[PDB]
Amino acid sequence: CQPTEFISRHNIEGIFTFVDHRCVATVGYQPQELLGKNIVEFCHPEDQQLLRDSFQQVVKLKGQVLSVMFRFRSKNQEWLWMRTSSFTFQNPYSDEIEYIICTNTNVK
Amino acid sequence: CQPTEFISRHNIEGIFTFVDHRCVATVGYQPQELLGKNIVEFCHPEDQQLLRDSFQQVVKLKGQVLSVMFRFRSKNQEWLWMRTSSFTFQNPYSDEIEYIICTNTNVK
């Protein structure tokens, strides 16, 4: 059984580099759909800033998992409540964040 | 304010590498308590091999999720039914398993 939770590997811009397989069970969106696209493009317009603010926040946090709750757009074009536990991945080289590992868990 | 479900990112041996801040409401065990510990240690004896085989199963799957229902020990040392959805993350480099994403969903 595929749970309503998936890992969203994307850079600071929101461009996904690697999408989970459980995304289709969560929002119904195919991994290939998120690839090259911004997560903000599939987020509730009035909650887009909420995502961005929290995104920049998790970058400043660095390593601190910040779960932001917002409404994401499904393949049905609907808006579901998802809690994205964003985890900034720091590289051991110079402590640079290569990408943000967002744990997208559907709540509603 | 989090549900009885959390993403348990750990290695094949069960050693928790990264645990979301949801385990507190699920089992009471703090993330730091799980870090460096085997999930099988806090697992019900009669369900240890169950989880063990499931771990090997998810490795054979690769990129697939395997939901196993066993009894996990809480901070109260009580046995609760947990539906651990193990997902094997495949690194897009040489297809190496970086870690196992075990979405622990408490049922009973």
Side-chain angles (χ1 to χ4, degrees):
Chain A
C1 313
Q2 300 214 330
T4 357
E5 176 186 80
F6 68 98
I7 288 299
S8 323
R9 256 178 165 137
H10 64 77
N11 79 332
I12 53 175
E13 296 171 278
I15 305 294
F16 295 83
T17 5
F18 193 64
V19 195
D20 203 288
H21 278 172
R22 299 164 290 161
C23 61
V24 199
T26 309
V27 290
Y29 252 73
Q30 297 297 334
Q32 302 95 332
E33 297 193 81
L34 283 314
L35 292 177
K37 286 271 93 192
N38 298 85
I39 173 168
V40 76
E41 299 186 84
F42 309 104
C43 182
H44 199 219
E46 315 97 290
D47 288 291
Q48 276 170 323
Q49 169 64 30
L50 172 75
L51 241 190
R52 177 178 171 195
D53 174 60
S54 307
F55 271 156
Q56 310 305 148
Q57 213 163 93
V58 77
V59 176
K60 294 168 63 177
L61 290 174
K62 256 190 181 176
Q64 189 52 212
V65 51
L66 180 63
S67 325
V68 54
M69 194 181 182
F70 57 93
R71 262 180 288 186
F72 202 80
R73 173 186 155 190
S74 72
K75 193 58 178 171
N76 296 332
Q77 271 53 266
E78 87 204 282
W79 310 101
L80 58 137
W81 280 93
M82 187 143 61
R83 183 196 59 248
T84 292
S85 292
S86 304
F87 166 61
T88 23
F89 196 64
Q90 302 149 267
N91 194 278
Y93 285 163
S94 316
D95 191 66
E96 340 99 274
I97 306 165
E98 44 191 77
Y99 57 74
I100 313 169
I101 316 176
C102 290
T103 321
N104 284 24
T105 323
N106 157 258
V107 197
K108 303 180 64 168
Chain B
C1 306
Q2 65 278 87
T4 19
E5 116 265 296
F6 63 102
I7 174 174
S8 334
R9 299 147 80 133
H10 59 180
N11 86 328
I12 52 180
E13 303 178 284
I15 303 290
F16 295 91
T17 320
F18 185 79
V19 187
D20 197 0
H21 289 143
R22 293 181 259 151
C23 56
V24 186
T26 318
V27 283
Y29 270 126
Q30 306 299 272
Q32 294 91 332
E33 305 191 76
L34 283 326
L35 299 183
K37 282 288 94 214
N38 298 86
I39 185 171
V40 64
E41 303 189 270
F42 315 92
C43 177
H44 198 222
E46 306 102 288
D47 297 286
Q48 284 187 327
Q49 173 58 33
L50 186 71
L51 232 196
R52 183 179 181 225
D53 175 57
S54 300
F55 274 128
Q56 313 302 149
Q57 288 197 33
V58 79
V59 173
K60 293 168 68 177
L61 284 172
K62 256 184 175 181
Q64 244 33 265
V65 65
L66 190 82
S67 26
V68 56
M69 193 180 185
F70 63 97
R71 269 187 280 184
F72 200 67
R73 203 179 71 234
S74 70
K75 187 63 182 179
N76 306 318
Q77 260 57 266
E78 84 206 283
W79 297 115
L80 42 91
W81 288 96
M82 186 86 69
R83 185 212 64 171
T84 294
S85 323
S86 311
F87 185 87
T88 19
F89 230 21
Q90 296 168 268
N91 192 38
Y93 203 107
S94 314
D95 189 53
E96 344 88 79
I97 305 174
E98 41 193 337
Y99 46 75
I100 304 175
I101 294 165
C102 288
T103 305
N104 273 29
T105 331
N106 164 261
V107 185
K108 310 178 75 196

